[PDB]
Design an enzyme around this catalytic site. Structure first.
Site, PDB file in Angstrom:
ATOM      1  N   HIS A  73       0.823  -1.201   0.000  1.00 29.07           N
ATOM      2  CA  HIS A  73       0.000   0.000   0.000  1.00 29.07           C
ATOM      3  C   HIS A  73       0.859   1.253   0.000  1.00 29.07           C
ATOM      4  O   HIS A  73       0.331   2.388   0.066  1.00 29.07           O
ATOM      5  CB  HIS A  73      -0.922   0.001   1.218  1.00 29.07           C
ATOM      6  CG  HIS A  73      -1.752  -1.235   1.329  1.00 29.07           C
ATOM      7  ND1 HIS A  73      -1.670  -2.099   2.398  1.00 29.07           N
ATOM      8  CD2 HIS A  73      -2.649  -1.779   0.474  1.00 29.07           C
ATOM      9  CE1 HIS A  73      -2.505  -3.107   2.217  1.00 29.07           C
ATOM     10  NE2 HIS A  73      -3.108  -2.938   1.055  1.00 29.07           N
TER      11      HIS A  73
ATOM     12  N   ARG B 171      -7.043   5.418   1.322  1.00 24.54           N
ATOM     13  CA  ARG B 171      -6.503   4.700   2.475  1.00 24.54           C
ATOM     14  C   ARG B 171      -5.196   5.368   2.860  1.00 24.54           C
ATOM     15  O   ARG B 171      -4.859   5.445   4.052  1.00 24.54           O
ATOM     16  CB  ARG B 171      -6.310   3.172   2.207  1.00 24.54           C
ATOM     17  CG  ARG B 171      -7.624   2.482   1.799  1.00 24.54           C
ATOM     18  CD  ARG B 171      -7.455   0.985   1.910  1.00 24.54           C
ATOM     19  NE  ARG B 171      -6.741   0.455   0.767  1.00 24.54           N
ATOM     20  CZ  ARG B 171      -6.667  -0.847   0.473  1.00 24.54           C
ATOM     21  NH1 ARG B 171      -7.131  -1.750   1.344  1.00 24.54           N
ATOM     22  NH2 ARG B 171      -6.046  -1.237  -0.620  1.00 24.54           N
TER      23      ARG B 171
ATOM     24  N   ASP C 191     -13.033  -8.656  -2.142  1.00 22.19           N
ATOM     25  CA  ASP C 191     -12.293  -8.345  -0.933  1.00 22.19           C
ATOM     26  C   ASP C 191     -12.870  -7.097  -0.196  1.00 22.19           C
ATOM     27  O   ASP C 191     -13.006  -5.991  -0.795  1.00 22.19           O
ATOM     28  CB  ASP C 191     -10.850  -8.089  -1.354  1.00 22.19           C
ATOM     29  CG  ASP C 191      -9.923  -7.929  -0.200  1.00 22.19           C
ATOM     30  OD1 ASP C 191     -10.285  -7.411   0.884  1.00 22.19           O
ATOM     31  OD2 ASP C 191      -8.745  -8.279  -0.432  1.00 22.19           O
TER      32      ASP C 191
ATOM     33  N   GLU D 252      -6.021 -12.806   6.479  1.00 24.54           N
ATOM     34  CA  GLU D 252      -4.814 -12.080   6.126  1.00 24.54           C
ATOM     35  C   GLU D 252      -4.268 -11.141   7.207  1.00 24.54           C
ATOM     36  O   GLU D 252      -3.055 -10.865   7.222  1.00 24.54           O
ATOM     37  CB  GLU D 252      -4.955 -11.365   4.803  1.00 24.54           C
ATOM     38  CG  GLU D 252      -5.537 -10.063   4.860  1.00 24.54           C
ATOM     39  CD  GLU D 252      -5.524  -9.421   3.452  1.00 24.54           C
ATOM     40  OE1 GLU D 252      -5.808 -10.165   2.483  1.00 24.54           O
ATOM     41  OE2 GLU D 252      -5.263  -8.205   3.309  1.00 24.54           O
TER      42      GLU D 252
ATOM     43  N   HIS E 101      -2.507 -15.250   1.215  1.00 31.42           N
ATOM     44  CA  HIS E 101      -2.438 -13.995   0.513  1.00 31.42           C
ATOM     45  C   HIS E 101      -1.261 -14.110  -0.456  1.00 31.42           C
ATOM     46  O   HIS E 101      -0.416 -14.931  -0.263  1.00 31.42           O
ATOM     47  CB  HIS E 101      -2.146 -12.978   1.580  1.00 31.42           C
ATOM     48  CG  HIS E 101      -2.261 -11.554   1.194  1.00 31.42           C
ATOM     49  ND1 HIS E 101      -3.455 -10.943   0.931  1.00 31.42           N
ATOM     50  CD2 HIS E 101      -1.347 -10.571   1.228  1.00 31.42           C
ATOM     51  CE1 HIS E 101      -3.254  -9.662   0.721  1.00 31.42           C
ATOM     52  NE2 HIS E 101      -1.979  -9.418   0.890  1.00 31.42           N
TER      53      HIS E 101
HETATM   54 NA    NA Z   1      -7.437  -9.327   1.107  1.00 31.44          NA
END
Ligand code: NA
Ligand code: NA
Ligand code: NA
Ligand code: NA
Lengths: 405, 405, 405, 405
Positions: free
Chosen positions: A32, A58, A225, A279, A328
């Site tokens: 991210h 985010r 997701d 995750e 993941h």
């Molecule tokens: Na995910």
């Protein structure tokens, strides 16, 4: 009948790239830690998106503050192994000021011992997962990398060998239709709206799924997701709104502590539709609790759940229950594990390409020689290099905030 | 950087037996119960058959020794071999030479998990999930780990992620715990001699027998009872409560292995702090899940019976996920190289092959050359520091080859 | 008031036909010991069909390695009884080298005693089912055959008599439409695709069911046999995809150890659709566990679950629960049992014809005078012969690998 | 080969009674409580009625002897007859002669299970699942087994698959266990004399009574209490715990038979290792399933009350499936020919018909000619070696025929 001779570990070192104390958008181990205009920051639903200031991005709430931890272990013969995870500068502190003491001077084969000591010694502050666990994982993965590099074997062979000749992948990103053309088996899209959006939010994310189903045909999988962003009632409504399009599963609807909510969500799921999570869970014992909720598939992140050593235990917990485990997507660190798991028939490739139209390596740019799926697959032969088969890109600007000894 | 170690393919598998009904009785080796006259192991031991007057004094009489020892050897194309032994004998060679060979030959020496899955999948219609066919599978899986460790030049314990302790401590199984304390063992497990058909006298005798050993052995040396499937819940509860005053640590295998519901009730009725254990006759990881769920304290697979080292490592993770211990049925080196790596196996079992339990006759005597024995009830990791499982096959034994292919 | 005088048993002998050490395609007691071009080997889904080398053919992975066991018991007056099962050469070893000791010298009426001794003595290696249990069953069935032959009664009369005047059958094979024309009440087809085939696999097997529903009309039953090949999620999806065609039941979706998976599968089944299993389970206590999962119908195989003596106990377990038992189709060995069971309203006839167009006897060619359904039925009068009413075809090439005494 | 034994059809069924309210009181026979004055069996025995001053001293006073003895005789067309007795008397003859005859007459002598199912199906609207109507059904089912064994020339125990033990050992029920030890019985069961309305004094008295027998009988001879439905959970728990110090083996029938939930709680509160038993007044296999599920240790149907030998064999399989024992309420030969074949009935009950429990008066005295009695608390299988149930009807007794058809 003369046993191979093994070095002791001489040094462990930690660096970081990106995060709040270096350069925004470093990518690498922190998925991210990206720049502007990226699908992965495009109005993704989260526990914070209910707040108008933190709805669109985010990054705005700090998904990117940690950056990438790099841990390199050096044996007395000067061979190195390393691995990368999400933790950055704080992960460096933990490794250089605390964990180094269990690591340095052990045999390169002493992986499960060091792993146990690392868990036992951090238990009072690790909270089961998150930052501290990501750091432990990064050390575990470096140890496996070094051990294979010393022996001259890929990790997947040390593990008891491949059980399939290639890994098949679904792709996670905003473009399942583009992924189908690249040869992936499925596409997992993020949800963009949350409980505070009500019926409109459900309508929009379900219409997104209906659109891709039309574009992709019946046999290409579609998944959502939800990144911890929902509650039981909203997730139930969303799952039922997507059932007409054969949504394969609905993932991480709830914050990871909400085991009891997972149990209720699985009970209320449409027939045939799977509910998944894992995750953000850490430690074998957390995955025991998670499995007993009745969720179909646990999805540990190798870099976060405690490392390869823990991942392998989680796979066996799933297998014991007649269930799949689908970690993941963590590039080579998951590849070498899942290609040996009879109950991981497919794996995840996360799109780090900003518009999901090209195949950027998943931990770009921190890994040299990092494989990418070709026609949606990675052949086992691609993984036939010692350790996890990659090298550290030392041209990235690695910062060393701490040292020891 | 480095090119991997080049690994050979598997060229041949071959199977032999010794002992059992079609050769020389009393061979010893892999079948622990293939013994001569006057052995403690055949001395009025309580069994599912001891209710019958004709089968009460001897286990040999009902045929506990009919199978004998299976030996599997796998040969790589570079001419290196690995091997293992288990209880299956001649029928075992049929399964290896006429069925399972097709999954073994032509694979890589690293394809251990792959072959394992293929052996389980292909025999599922006739294996019964444990017993003879599982013993055969387990013996092949161990031969493969042996061969792999030998090709690589590493002890299996190092390929598994290394020791988490510098030595293994042992309790001893047989009729003379008082003597085992003198040899340095941490405890002693006695067989029961009476069964449900013996009523209160049976309980009084076996409890008296334990009261005597507490007296001779002092309060800190562990005492346990092995019941070899010979009881029912009520008789087992009476026994455990009759032995509570002597701080009996656990009561083992009270019931036939199918009686999961009965183990659940037995565990619920056990004296506070006394353990109920089982598992030596269970096979397949899924059977162990159902076992673990009954709430018993310790599962005890035999490595050469439960499905192999591959399965044992899975059972270990299952127990660890539940915060519980796993303590294999003493299987010499096959267990040692496993349990030394398991955080949740803090001690191990040495089963007395000595007729009168006075000496350290090796566990698989005479079939294994250089077989370690507990030196002062302990076995140090340096002893294990030889390739594969670190032993050689005794070809002076009269190995028979009933089948070839 | 003078009791009939009964002989002791003098000899037991075992032969085999087919299997890996005789002639491929022997048929007889091993249903899967067939030749080329047979529906029963036509891309049938299995736990191994996920492997490209073992997808098209079950023979390829070794479904046929065992062949047929024949057990014949001879009384001191020279009357014989016999029965056949799946076990072949290894079953001969067990009978000739171990079990003969409980059999020889008993009264011909000592069936339940011998059965108990056989279970008690093999418990340490039988694993609950499979090969060893098939062998015990074959001995149990021979004992019943002999006892009825000595008394001069059909087994069904010794059991307390028929409760219906004929047995009605469904047929198992690739052609439910042909079976309807032969007068059967239903047809059970195998599935051909498995979890690794995903939505396509579900589409194809559901389309197969939809096609036969159109050909056969609403009242002829349709069922799918899944032969242990699925997991909970795939079975759920398949059951729901077939619900629109009123699929009567879905059978053996999971490996037999997966009791907990059966419980979850039954909970997720479409309303009114039954979930069944049991043909690979063995021992009364295993069927207790299976019944408590909530599956609608247990389907023991007489030749595999432990014999007639066990089958009768399983019927009572079902009856106690207000449920049907529908044993796998085992020719005369199931006929004489089920015609006495109030809770077995119908039975199974397996097509051993290669293209399911004719009525080959089910254990062809090992049984002389073997009845076949006529207009889908076997009249009780057809079974009115002593024992199981057949003779052993001694023109088959029976091999005797072992002898004793 | 051989032509079967030719079997006749059933021509007539006929029913008689002795004793009970419409004939001579104190007849004995099938109704155990149809006794004279001064019998231990009527000596202040605790009951659901003993709270009432008028019904406290005698069970006869509230009418335990009103029914008397039902006798059913079935006659084949070849003129052979079989018979049995139970508790039902005159109303029993009404049910046989005016209802159940239609299912019995004209059937084969081998149609036992068929008739049994028809009797249960046809009386389901008035049977209450136990009691009087069930006793009647049971008596007919036993007459049929008798007749069949007699036509065939075999003891019922041999038609059931033969003895699994060479003799039956017995505990004795009544007021003098000290004496029963002298007659060779393996234990003794005493009635309780006080009930919940007697409070702590009641418990102290009955416990004292047991303390005395432990003293006189030594530690190995079993002691048990029969409570004949007379308690509640709290009183029963107090009693069991007051008797624990004397190693009371079991406590029997504490509650009325409907109180399944109460048996579950009672079993949960019982002293460790002490058994809780019940079942003598239960009827129908489905009632026994619900009973077994309460967790009680031993079910105890009366063969002539629970539904017949056909039902008893089913209850045995139900218990065996759960790893538990089944120990019928002593029903003379009707139990003996069953229990001798049950692996899970390791002992049996002899109920003292002797007024002062000093002598071996036969169980069904005087109605059965040549009725075996325990010879040294044992009954050998040779004694049972007569056709059917091996006894004759005493036609010197004053048999009344209230109905014909
Ligand atoms: Na995910
Ligand atoms: Na043991
Ligand atoms: Na089937
Ligand atoms: Na009673």
């Amino acid at each position: 009948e003369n046993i191979m001779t093994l070095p002791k570990i001489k040094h462990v070192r930690a660096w970081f790239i990106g995060g709040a104390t270096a350069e925004k958008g470093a990518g690498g181990g922190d998925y991210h830690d990206q720049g502007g205009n990226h699908w992965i920051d495009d109005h993704i639903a989260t526990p914070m998106s209910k707040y108008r200031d933190y709805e669109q991005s985010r990054q705005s709430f700090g998904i990117n503050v940690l950056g990438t931890l790099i841990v390199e272990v050096e044996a007395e013969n000067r061979q190195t192994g390393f691995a990368v995870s999400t933790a950055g500068e704080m992960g460096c502190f933990i490794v250089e000021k605390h964990l180094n003491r269990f690591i340095e001077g052990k045999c390169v084969s002493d992986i499960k011992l060091i792993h146990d000591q690392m868990l036992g010694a951090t238990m009072y502050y690790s909270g089961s997962g998150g930052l501290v666990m990501n750091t432990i994982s990064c050390v575990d993965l470096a140890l496996w990398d070094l051990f294979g590099k010393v022996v001259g074997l890929p990790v997947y062979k040390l593990l008891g060998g491949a059980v399939r000749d290639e890994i098949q992948f679904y792709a996670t990103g905003a473009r399942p239709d583009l992924a189908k053309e690249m040869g992936f088996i499925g596409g997992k899209m993020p949800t963009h709206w949350g409980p505070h959006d009500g019926d409109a939010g459900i309508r929009k994310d379900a219409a997104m799924v209906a659109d891709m189903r039309e574009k992709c045909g019946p046999d290409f999988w579609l998944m959502l997701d939800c990144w911890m962003s929902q509650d039981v009632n909203y997730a139930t409504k969303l799952a039922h709104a997507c059932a007409p399009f054969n949504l394969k599963w609905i993932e991480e609807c709830l914050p990871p502590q909400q085991y009891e909510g997972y149990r209720e969500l699985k009970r209320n799921a449409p027939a045939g539709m799977m509910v998944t999570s894992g995750e953000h869970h850490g430690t074998l014992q957390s995955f025991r609790t998670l499995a007993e909720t009745g969720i179909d598939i646990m999805q540990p992140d190798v870099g976060w759940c405690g490392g390869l050593t823990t991942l392998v235990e989680i796979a066996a917990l799933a297998k014991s229950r007649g269930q799949l485990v689908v970690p993941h997507g963590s590039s080579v660190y998951s590849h070498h594990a899942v290609i040996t798991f009879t109950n991981t028939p497919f794996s995840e490739f996360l799109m780090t390409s900003p518009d999901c139209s090209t195949l950027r390596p998943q931990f770009d740019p921190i890994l040299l020689d990092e494989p990418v799926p070709v026609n949606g697959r990675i052949h086992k032969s691609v993984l036939d290099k010692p350790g996890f088969g990659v090298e550290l890109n030392r041209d990235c600007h690695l910062k060393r905030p701490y040292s020891h000894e």
